[PDB]
Amino acid sequence: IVSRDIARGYERIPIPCVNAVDSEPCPSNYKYVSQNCVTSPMNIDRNITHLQYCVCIDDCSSSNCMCGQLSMRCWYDKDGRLLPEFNMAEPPLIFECNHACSCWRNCRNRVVQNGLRARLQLYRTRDMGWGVRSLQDIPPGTFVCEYVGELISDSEADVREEDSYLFDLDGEVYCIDARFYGNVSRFINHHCEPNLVPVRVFMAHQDLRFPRIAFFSTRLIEAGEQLGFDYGERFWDIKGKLFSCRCGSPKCRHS
Numbered sequence: 001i002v003s004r005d006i007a008r009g010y011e012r013i014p015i016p017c018v019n020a021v022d023s024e025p026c027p028s029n030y031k032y033v034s035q036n037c038v039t040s041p042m043n044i045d046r047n048i049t050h051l052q053y054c055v056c057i058d059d060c061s062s063s064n065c066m067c068g069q070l071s072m073r074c075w076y077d078k079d080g081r082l083l084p085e086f087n088m089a090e091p092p093l094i095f096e097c098n099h100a101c102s103c104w105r106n107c108r109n110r111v112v113q114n115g116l117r118a119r120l121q122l123y124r125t126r127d128m129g130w131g132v133r134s135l136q137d138i139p140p141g142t143f144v145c146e147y148v149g150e151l152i153s154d155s156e157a158d159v160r161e162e163d164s165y166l167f168d169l170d171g172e173v174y175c176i177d178a179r180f181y182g183n184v185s186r187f188i189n190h191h192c193e194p195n196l197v198p199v200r201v202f203m204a205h206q207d208l209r210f211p212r213i214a215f216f217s218t219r220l221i222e223a224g225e226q227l228g229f230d231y232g233e234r235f236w237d238i239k240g241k242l243f244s245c246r247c248g249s250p251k252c253r254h255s
């Protein structure tokens with residue numbers, strides 16, 4: 001227990017850090033943030049009259065809900081989990097209800113905006129590196145965490161040496177750099193057969209240039225299992241030569 005909570009009380013549940021390998025302290029060469037931040041002007045469209053919203057009089061579980069229509073359909077179930085019909089291989093954009101909607105703060109189309117649910121833990125792996133794992137089981141289709149970091153422009157990313165903490169959002173494109181500013185996600189390692197899938201979501205605003213990145217369980221995750229996701233082509237076409245993937249997956253396409 002080298003740290004009770006790396007979020008310093010910002011998440012709904014603490015995220016302790018333990019080291020059972022070497023004697024290295026908890027990471028501290030970065031600033032933890034639970035929400036995306038910017039280090040410059042960023043003209044995100046927060047015009048409330050530009051938001052598309054719903055006028056549901058129920059708990060938004062009907063076929064009429066405008067917000068679900070935008071998402072093709074609401075994909076959350078009564079518990080807040082993704083429906084089996086959800087395409088993990090090619091996720092759709094999810095538009096959750098927002099403050100312009102007529103519904104209540106507890107309608108069914110609100111999951112990612114409710115914050116952390118699963119008890120996670122940061123820990124030192126054998127590789128002398130760091131990783132994240134669940135201290136409880138996570139049913140499939142559950143929202144685990146968001147990839148939070150510093151929001152930056154395309155070119156801005158091009159002039160950064162350390163680029164291992166970037167996440168492309170995909171006109172002009174933007175990125176999230178978790179190197180200097182980030183949440184528990186910056187510590188999640190790559191894996192070829194990932195139990196976490198990133199989903200572009202929209203909540204308080206609907207500026208398509210800035211989707212927020214939500215990670216969902218692509219299958220059951222057992223207490224103690226290590227979270228992971230597919231970093232992607234761009235990553236490996238750059239780091240593939242500095243080293244080969246040590247994910248240990250029978251289907252590894254990078255080692």
Ligand SMILES: COc1cc2c(NC3CCN(Cc4ccccc4)CC3)nc(NCCCN(C)C)nc2cc1OCCCCCN
Nearest residue numbers: 154157158159160161163164165166167168231232234235
């Ligand atoms: C490490 O993996 C990634 C590298 C990226 C990168 N790297 C560049 C390489 C060249 N140096 C060059 C340089 C460095 C220093 C000084 C001058 C020039 C600058 C950083 N650039 C951009 N977007 C940049 C815009 C490209 N644009 C032309 C479209 N996105 C990236 C997304 C990555 O992971 C994605 C998966 C997530 C992994 C999460 N852990």
Ligand SMILES: [Zn+2]
Nearest residue numbers: 054056060065
């Ligand atoms: Zn609705």
Ligand SMILES: [Zn+2]
Nearest residue numbers: 060097103107
């Ligand atoms: Zn709603």
Ligand SMILES: [Zn+2]
Nearest residue numbers: 054067097101
């Ligand atoms: Zn709505």
Ligand SMILES: [Zn+2]
Nearest residue numbers: 192245247252
């Ligand atoms: Zn691999």
